[model samples]
Target: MSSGVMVDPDVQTSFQKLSEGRKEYRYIIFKIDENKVIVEAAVTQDQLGITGDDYDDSSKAAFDKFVEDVKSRTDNLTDCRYAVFDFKFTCSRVGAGTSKMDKIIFLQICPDGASIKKKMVYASSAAAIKTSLGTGKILQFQVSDESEMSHKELLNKLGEKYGDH
Candidate 1:
């Protein structure tokens, strides 16, 4: 099993927000187990069910709920393993609600055999996934738009990478 320092609440909140959905971005997380890749969780910003300028409060509430949901799903798994987190943030340059400037950020979490020596990298584009992870291996897939990758695709990529591991 993997063990590491507990992630800070604020950092966890931010990452969860991306996965739980916020008006500012979309996020998804996959679980990599010894034999299978499962879409452990997913969320959209709109699903937060919050509104108005009370973003701080809304975000906190949304993050709390997201944490609760994840805990319930995995029974709070705390160990070293590999997983993928894909994010698509809406860019303001395109005048809102446009995917023109949208970028995909793929985060791969690989921990040391028994420590929390987690290594991560962000890819701004699909093609970047190959080079950004040089010597570091993970799953693979392609998307015209960062927003185009679905939960199914995420799992497929993981399966391709560790299907034999």
Candidate 2:
């Protein structure tokens, strides 16, 4: 159990702020340093504003911007990172035709291009982070590359979750 990866106290504070406290941050990007999971940034909704027209599929640009923000920080998708994003989208349910839903998605991003060591660290370190954040409280997924994080792809994933079975 000595994974050596301890969640920083500030991280919980950040999550609390983003999750329930003030509801200020729309997303949080986390990073591991010296075996500690720390908060890189808790971006507010105002900053990463969702711009679009309809509830069907007008969320890509902002999500793309989020992706760009992540990529820009991680050496254009070369480095590894962990992100917590509030994904807002609409979907058709099994009974209801359409409904809007938002979930706190915990993203475990470790690009294939990253060094084996970095990837391995992030790979095994996921559980601790998830546990620290309290999984099941949020939707969690891993993205090895950019394409997997596309807005369209994410909407489809959300659709499957709340959509028809």
Candidate 3:
């Protein structure tokens, strides 16, 4: 909040497109320009080259492709990126035994390769975009190394969150 940075209006509007589409983007990558955040890329299901059914092992493929795309864009660069993904998977519904969940995830991807100054700026500037989006909530995660960006790691995190206590 101290950064005095602001999220661009399009970021909020884009949330509708990101949230509403049936495999529309599946994942959307964002970047910061000066004092504003903007869409760097919005990846479609077709763009990901997944022919499998929705929310199946194909999800693993989609996630793999999305990870590759993010790395391709800013892997060794001195910049960070913000992204959102639709995480569709099955989970135990307690009484019903199982159900599918289509959850949105927010990623604060500040790879180790990014410059220290860039990481600090993006860290301080994250809330602006999240706050502007909507009153609803989404799962949030932070990543500093490539190893932390795997699909199973995400599944583990999701499990920890939804597991019956």
- The candidate maximizing TM-score is 2
Tens-place lDDT per residue, model 3, 53-162, is 33544556665665667567765545477877666666667778666666677777776666776576687667677777764666788887555666666655665686
Query: Where does candidate 2 have its weakest 10-residue lDDT segment?
Result: 48-57
Give each model's whole-structure lDDT: 0.35, 0.67, 0.66
Off by over 4 Å in 1: 1-26, 49-101, 113-165
- Candidate 2 residue runs with Cα over 4 Å from true position: 1-3, 22-25, 48-59, 65-76, 162-165
The sequence of per-residue lDDT tens digits that candidate 2 reaches over residues 1-165 is: 245677778877778776775442356778877677878887654555544322334655666666677667877677676777666677766666667776666777777767776567776677788787675665567777777887877767656765653
C-alpha TM-score for every candidate = 0.29, 0.78, 0.77
lDDT of 1: 0.35
Model 3 lDDT on a 0 to 1 scale: 0.66
Off by over 4 Å in 3: 1-3, 21-25, 52-57, 65-79, 92-98
Report model 2's TM-score to 2 decimal places.
0.78
Better-scoring candidate (lDDT), 1 or 2: 2
Deviation of model 2 at 60, angstroms: 3.2
Candidate 2 versus truth, CA RMSD in Å, comes to 3.4
